[PDB]
């Protein structure tokens, strides 16, 4: 949270905003692994008592 420091980032371009997409890029697919390894069935079965 430094105003003058942030100005130095603008002239350096679009690096960190790009990897923020990349980090979210891995994050969104990180959960995508879960349903394709656990949510293989759309019917929830309860065992008999």
């Amino acid at each position: 949270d430094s105003t003058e420091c942030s100005n130095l980032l603008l002239q350096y371009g679009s690096f960190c905003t790009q990897l923020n997409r990349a980090l979210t890029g891995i994050a969104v697919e990180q959960d995508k692994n879960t349903q394709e390894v656990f949510a293989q069935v759309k019917q929830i079965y309860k065992t008999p008592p």
């Binding site: 949270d1 923020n20 979210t24 969104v28």
Partner: protein, 49 residues
């Protein structure tokens, strides 16, 4: 989201567009405790100079 996506037709999905933080207002500072006074009265108001 439109500005960061560089488009006017955004699809249904999650989009992280910015960040937020709480800005301090008063910025209080209470470090000191007045002690170890060196007498300036012994050099300003001494009887004999």
């Amino acid at each position: 989201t439109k500005c960061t996506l560089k488009s006017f037709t955004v699809e249904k999905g999650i989009y992280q567009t910015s960040n937020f933080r709480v800005q301090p207002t008063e910025s209080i500072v209470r470090f000191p405790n007045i002690t170890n006074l060196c007498p300036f009265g012994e050099v300003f108001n001494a009887t004999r100079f």
